[model samples]
Target chain A: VQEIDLGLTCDMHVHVREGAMCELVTPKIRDGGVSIAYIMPNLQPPITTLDRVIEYKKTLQKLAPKTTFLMSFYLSKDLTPDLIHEAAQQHAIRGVKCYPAGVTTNSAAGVDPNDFSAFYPIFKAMQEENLVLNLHGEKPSVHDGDKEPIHVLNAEEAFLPALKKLHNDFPNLKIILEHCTSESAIKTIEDINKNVKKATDVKVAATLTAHHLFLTIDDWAGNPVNFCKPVAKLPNDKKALVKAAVSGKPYFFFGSDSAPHPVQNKANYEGVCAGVYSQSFAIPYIAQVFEEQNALENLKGFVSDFGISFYEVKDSEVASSDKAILFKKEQVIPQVISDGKDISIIPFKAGDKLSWSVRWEPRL
Target chain B: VQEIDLGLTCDMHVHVREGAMCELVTPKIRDGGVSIAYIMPNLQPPITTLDRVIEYKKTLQKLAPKTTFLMSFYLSKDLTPDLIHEAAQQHAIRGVKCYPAGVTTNSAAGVDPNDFSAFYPIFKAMQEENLVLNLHGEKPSVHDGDKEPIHVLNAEEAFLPALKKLHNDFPNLKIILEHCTSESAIKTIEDINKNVKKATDVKVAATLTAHHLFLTIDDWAGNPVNFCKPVAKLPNDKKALVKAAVSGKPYFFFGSDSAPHPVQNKANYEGVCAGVYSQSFAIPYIAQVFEEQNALENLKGFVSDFGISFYEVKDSEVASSDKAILFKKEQVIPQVISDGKDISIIPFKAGDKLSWSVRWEPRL
Candidate 1:
């Protein structure tokens, strides 16, 4: 096995365990000077307070001790616009995340569309707070049932109109349309950014999961491991998503959304996992897809350039002797650690011959 | 120079030299066993009467004694529905060529959109009479200034609607959407035969030039020889046309549209000749495009089956003599043949490493 950096990595949808039991779930990621930042909004007591946000960052600081944590604030029923504004002004919150109510696993406490009127104050406050609106834009009413429809309700139908409305109200709001699954979504985001005032600064962004680009609907049957929420759309959709992600659009950037659950959870329809446990092998998998699409030129911007631009993170590097994060060597994430629980599920695209291999050494 | 058969070639669009001088323009064909048909309406008299139509066909028969003389019943102000029905039923008039008014070089005598209502009864009569409506489908009024937009305008605005109405009124009407330029045109023709009732029995058809499919917009700037009436459309449009022709779609077929002109006349756009002169090399140009697209499976069907099926002629056979045409050969037409003379323009790839060559042998 050979070792190489698959560029600097990130997880936009990463959920870090917080509170008193944080240490049990916290990864002991020793720095070899390679940067890693976890997305916030705590798993337990789900970090709805400025106190809670501050507490979690302080705890992460203690555990990584030498390292730091940039946080993500939850937009929920209990999390008021005032508290979110306070957190943003203090730079305790990097962005405010909006989750649709009753969608996915832990988002029951998310914002309801009927209650969007209640969040008007929050949208108004973000301008003063200079906060980025990190959105999990989905219409829960559309896909409330089990048997998934052919199209999982287009993001263009709901998310686009919402972005336009938000832009009209808060023209300077930095909107991130998270985890886009269709090319139409990309076009909508692009069209909105073009029409809106100061659209370049105020934008809608989304992350492309490695699996979404690589596996199409054709690969879904009898391949439960490849399936995930915003369910594997049509091949046409896959082609569009891949094109948008690789297009190096200014508003677009990388976010590994690698939410993993135990194999039993993925196996059970009732306890299905929304995220793929993929951050560990993300770089190599991403590289392989780029190569397949003849888009190697896009890799640097997608992984190294744009992510850093989005997060406003400084340049950082990792050496083989430092942390041993090498992509050329073959390695697998067999443990399936996710959401602080080790459920031991199958990795996405498992057993498939990976084009780029990984080799990691624990030197640092 | 090597000589090869054009594999049952004919030109669907050509006008004889204008005037009573037009009747004097009949000349013997260069080769025997190849069928060549001319459009009915001559320049001066315009074949308005049954006697004129009979006179034109008999003269063509007398001039090229061995060839079949198939006259078109020119649709005109003078050529009423009764006359068209009479001419189509006449053994001399093999088909009724309905040119939509104000189209190309000389279509002042053609039918107007308003005429479809007036001529619907004639078309219904022609349907029962089993006469082919050889449509010169270009409608120039909507797109008069531009050269190629007429191709699109003709098919979409006038021909398709008229054809659909004709199909509905007389399910057995033999409507042909001729000289297909737009994707909409090809699609409309395909729809008639595949979906409409009695469309196949009615013998609805289309005929295309080699230039439209093989050469595109870029070809006009590079090769003046390729510039024709129904202009080269978008690249994808050309690709789809090639696919349809090469897919063995039995309804799809070819027409040379090979009207030769003096070199100086070719340079003059005011009266520039609109045909590609492809009868000699039509088969080779088509094969090359198909081979490049990796769709060689439909070659024999395109070159032979579809046309033969439409014309009710015997399909041509490839000879056992290791013969094929190639694009490498350089052949040019004479500046102009004598006023009443005939000469053959040989295949494009006359002497080259071609996989398939046309070899002519006496049909027993």
Candidate 2:
């Protein structure tokens, strides 16, 4: 129990933004105990073109040569069926991320989730390529006349029907409901995967974040740092998330939706940026949760085996084959992880004592 | 339509803190078109004794000579039946304010709201003296084993049974549920007051805040400035609050729970203070809502008459003979109200424009 080997750790969901912010967070992936990082395409101008996603990965790879980057295109009118084919042919992207417009940062280019018929042609192309459909599963917030108003508390659950419909229409397409923060969404994911007999049979799956396992609505009520899209729901919802994470469910795996925001963004009176920066301590956080629930036996499958298998990541795509070793190394998360300048990140559970840390080891 | 007399305006719930904060906000009551302010007793060390309550009123009166200050004692183990009767006899306090422990700022010294049987003796004394009991109706949040969790969203509703029982236990005792944020709380107040033929016959009443009329859970999600204890509920709750505010219902009136915190408190990564500062523009904010709903006629009654009538404030208690005049005067709220120093306040809906303003006029 003192040292456990997590081989070829993969983080399926991540956001390391562009420019100075991007440069600072890119290399931290390996340090957080990951060999491969699935980079999100939500930039200032969301990544859509074939050349841009290729170039984006190139920059990330240059920044962290030890970490493999899984790139994706932002789903929008800017994308076409032919573009999906070209991107797939070039191996520019492994998935396409769909964000409902105006819900989260850099998501202004995202499409209307209410109607995805226009994108059906693009999804068809994706299905042919076996490229995953990564869903930022939330509707555009609406509280209109005589209709149920979609706020943060219910936004995730509200989008559940759309997810079910999408799964039904494209029965073979791989879809991931990223950052499952609610009980209803968790239930929907489980119901979808009920018929699957093997790990490879999961056409529909979900990725649980490290923060969601520990957070409820109370944590974010006054704290701007814990605030994120589909604001972490009530205590019962947290209970459901923790149980699902530790259940060793194949359809559910680790996606450290470790979205990082600047200190300036966190220090605001209004319109505080929505994210939690846990990429720097991703595995340790998830490992702690599993250990608490007496389900540490499932940690490796969740953090490495299941997510990598679901994405069908090739051996050639892995930049390094080194296993990450989780050992009993007591430490305190720093107040701020700085780049020796104006840019700094206040990490999740900042300044709190942690029971474990990670180090790299040989595959043998 | 241009000018209306809002006679003897009363704010049934308010918080102007101690020392510098008290000096800064005490006079904003009249600026906000309130003739009488029923002051909350939740401070660093809560106001439980008679001399402190008397001295605190004197400090507020000196700040705003034209405004009447109706003070109260914070309900705790510190309060005895003898203290309540003595305070009532000396005309030191008009009501006793009850806060559930650990819900909001300065509420650390509050009583455990679950078993009010302990405070029944104090309630009896208040009943005999005809002194009102102002209930901050919310349970201490709980998420314990298999039981229904009480959160900011449902905390007010969860406390309703205790309210109903209190009314049943002391049918003739005057109780006011202050700053009600949910439809269930609104409905509970209405159900309790259903048999009453007139405003004077009502034994249980509720106070609605200006912020609650405009804000739902979304307004506070990212904007920590809008966040408060017993947080704003769903849109339907807001609809209920507005309907009750404009319905000219005897049991519902204005109580701008205008709790203020310094910039250091709000500009936080975690533990942002729970409050909204609306004291400086209370009437104009309420006036805008009324005009939008086509319920401007009920403005005076909700703001002035119902609150004053509920408390049964005597003519001798009046410090100002001037009436507040509401007119079509457009202006934007300031970014901050300052002492031209380090202490600057970011008021509610800062920089937002309103179509109405208040001016004082003779009682004639």
Candidate 3:
């Protein structure tokens, strides 16, 4: 029964694909009042260069003129310290994403975290330039061979030691374990903060996806649409993520990792890709979940302020000209969305009614 | 290079539906040389009475005359002790199957274990009459509510306390924890056996399915054909089950819980029925796995001997007229089986080649 108004929001993690797909996603993000989004770089030919980042940003901004789109370079052996520092100075890219090979969508060309020292130069450069290292945060070995399905459930946990090593190697490196879905991952961030004792800067944090926040592994039992990389885990894990979201912890913030796969890939029995297209109703669903927990008091910080502070974006960079978003007490989600043939995607909580409805207004 | 000859096998758990569908299953069972099969009772209007049991028995025998079909009375509120005793006296049924409600296919009318003590009379009568009590061995509550899928992964373990209580209350009763898929379930059965000591009248045992022995949760990742009620579990769980099967433990036996559903139901994204139709390739697959483990010496006891002894079936009853079947070094499984429309079902490991082949000579 509690209605709330949110300032223009920022989705720290989002998957708005290139070309025709941008038509389907742009309206949704603009209408959702997302003033900025950290667009992932895992495309067919990943955005591994400063030139690609600038091109992708232009295409996205042209599609959604009112929204600012921050780009990330897919971390690879070819990216140099000069490239990192220059991209930061020029503001062409805001983060560097590391995907363990084959960890998620289009990440077959990802860097192996085991060769962490080999990429030490990249991590050091990002740290020196105050850039975030966004990780897919799963061990690829756990998904290797014909046996991934069995061990894939534990893949997230297997990568924890490597995460710890990354932190140990570069104590001040800003890392965001992308789409975190486990308790230990949350605990790692908390433990890092506790050990650092009174550091003012964001040393370590996590991106909490809407799917991981609202649904448990139970939702994935017979339902494939709920499946994603770092797959939704036990009830306890979901509860822990929700608890962190509501605890007003500055270390946890919104990152709607709303990766969308075409319906053909998701609805099949074999060789199905993992993703949940939540961009269609991401903000409203998060509001509904927060309200259900009576944590409306902490909602603004999670959706906007904390991420803004963590990423160190200037006020004017994310500042809205006007208060353009309002959420009512209830909303109904669409079952499916398609741009005619070959682009149909199932959104999270499909056909389910939420207790929060969203309205967006643009300052003319 | 090591060929093995298996005596008449007994698939302790199988789902061969009634009437026209029997044509597809009967020949497969006979050619596989499964002399006896513990037919599951979860059918449309399940075989709940001795009359229905006898009717189903005759129909099955007519389809596969060489294989002895041992029937089970579907346990329900309507099944009485008098009926159990008479059915045992007339040799009409060998076991009584208990399916937890809504845990698997056609199991909507199953008994709740919370009311398990209320069925003590039936257990006692079964004990007194020397009949086996075969349990589906999963707690439905663990799979109930919105938190199910995560906990459903451990549903088999949740039913352990009830299994123990049944054993303690009726120390002489024969119980088969059907299609167990967890280390906890296997350990529970082992613990019970150790506690039971010298009272060797088949107090407790667990069924090992091909999906559990050869496949792990890995096989079910994007593949629904490998999905079943308990859901093929972790690699550790699968390894433990295979270890027990090869350990020469009399309490662990084979039950190819090969419940098949039509392609229409198994290949969808949502609401797919749980089962692996391994009956078509059960024998060869088991042989291949055992050979891989260098436990071929223990394969006969697993597929035939251990179950025959556990069920207290007489040698003369299950004895085939000809010399036992011979399995060569290599064999390939069929891709699919169909009796025209609506009857086609994909068998486990469809289109995969097995290293073991079987040669059966039915005494016609």
State which candidate has the highest lDDT.
2
lDDT tens digits, residues A1-364, model 1?
A: 3344434545455554543324533342322122355464736456688777787777776766533355787787776777866787777887877777655557777887535778888888886766778777666544224533212334334555676677778777777777777667777777865754431453556777777776653333223455455555555577678788778666666665666555554443112345555554566667677777777676666765666566665534221232324444344434344344543445656655565654334443
Residue-wise C-alpha lDDT for candidate 1, range B40-66, written one tens digit per residue? 463454666789777766666656554
Lowest-sum lDDT 10-residue window in model 2 chain A: A139-148
Q: Runs in model 3 with CA error above 4 Å? A: A141-150, A195-200, A315-324, A361-364, B142-150, B195-200, B319-324, B340-342, B362-364
Candidate 2 per-residue lDDT over residues A251-304, each given as its tens digit:
988998888888999989888999999989988888789888888889999999
TM-score, each model?
A: 0.45, 0.97, 0.93
Per-residue lDDT for A193-267 in model 3, tens only? Answer: 774443346678887888888776556666667767877777778888999888888888899988877777766
Any residue pairs clashing in model 3, and if so which?
Answer: A149-B218, A150-B218, A329-A355, A330-A355, B330-B355
- Scored against the true structure, residue B170 in model 1 reaches a CA lDDT of 68
Q: Which one wins on DockQ?
A: 2
Clashing pairs in 1: A259-A275, A329-A358, B139-B154, B323-B356, B323-B357, B324-B356, B324-B357, B325-B356, B325-B357
Q: Lowest summed-lDDT stretch of 10 residues in model 1 chain A?
A: A315-324
- Which scores better on DockQ, 1 or 3? 3
Which stretches of candidate 2 lie above 4 Å from their native place? none
